[PDB]
Design a protein around this ligand. Structure first.
Ligand code: FMN
Ligand code: FMN
Lengths: 178, 165
């Protein structure tokens, strides 16, 4: 019951890459945005806690304000069709270095791994972003939504340039066979 | 262009499910084993740090041992074709979980099945392995072939999960 053959499954692993620049002229349809939200939502988590909230930022000025405080990621964020803000839930909403906080981030990180695979399946591109001023991006999103704890960002869109070459430590360093 | 069309992308997200029991007859080829390991290795991380190590358990006797300490996951793990032990070497040491999500998606693309496992005793699971590896064990992933259909998706509302800006 496979979906893609070896050649295709291998290509996807390479197409899943950190897209450093996006086609600013490519706009996300409601269909594209909705499926991405479903890829995020349908992700797995321990005891199905789903301690995440995904904020889809498509407004250019609002994304631009976040971009201005993402340092070297500014032009990239600006270029992107959409910017996902992966928010971690409060521990008070979870229950009916901090242990609960780290647990929640672990679930959020899983979702991220699923999302970026989904984005490649559609034919689009992403870049996970942790290089940003956390206090400042919260600031410009405060009046819009309650002050969130941000795990990471995910820039989204269509690429202008080809995928960068994969650089990973040796199969030996990463894999033990038993 | 697309790798898969709309229907098949939507189908996959349901095929990507926590498989509770596996075909205890089915055995992983080397080719199946090697892809699963490469999906894991090509995962993304901060500054390409790759703060992880993946241990592939296939031997039925050693897997049987790990399953004995896996509480309510005992039969599942014994019946699986393989068992991956995911280990970590801001905060960056949690980013092995980014791999986890990529792996399970890649596994389902092959038309196989997986279950992410957090229900185990890390003391005794680490003990039976420590004659070889130096941990830190984050979680487990059972890998193999299903015996029945994928479970129904239960999730909180789209409204609970998504803010549209
Ligand atoms: C970190 C982690 C640990 C998990 N541990 C277990 C487990 O010990 N036992 C189990 O039955 N399921 C476990 N699961 C599976 C979740 O219960 C499952 O992801 C959730 O119910 C969503 O359903 P789905 O994966 O079938 O789509 C775990 C999932 C994650 C992400
Ligand atoms: C938590 C996290 C944060 C990241 N932040 C950035 C970033 O701020 N800027 C950037 O260009 N890439 C960022 N990346 C992408 C990684 O640098 C990239 O995944 C790694 O170099 C491997 O390359 P690849 O994904 O293209 O295979 C981030 C990745 C992760 C997991």
């Amino acid at each position: 019951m496979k979906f893609l053959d070896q050649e295709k499954r291998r290509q996807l692993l390479n197409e899943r890459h950190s897209c450093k620049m996006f086609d600013s002229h490519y706009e996300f349809s409601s269909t594209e945005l909705e499926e991405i939200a479903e890829i995020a939502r349908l992700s797995p988590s321990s005891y199905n806690t789903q301690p995440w909230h995904f904020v889809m930022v498509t407004d250019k000025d609002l994304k631009k304000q976040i971009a201005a405080h993402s340092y070297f990621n500014e032009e990239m964020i600006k270029s992107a069709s959409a910017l996902m803000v992966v928010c971690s839930l409060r521990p008070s909403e979870l229950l009916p270095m901090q242990r609960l906080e780290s647990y929640i981030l672990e679930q959020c990180y899983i979702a991220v791994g699923q999302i970026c695979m989904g984005v490649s399946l559609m034919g689009l591109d992403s870049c996970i972003i942790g290089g940003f001023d956390p206090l400042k991006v919260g600031e410009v999103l405060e009046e819009r939504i309650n002050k969130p704890k941000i795990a990471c960002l995910i820039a989204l869109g269509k690429r202008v340039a080809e995928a960068s070459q994969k650089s990973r430590k040796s199969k030996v360093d990463a894999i033990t066979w038993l």
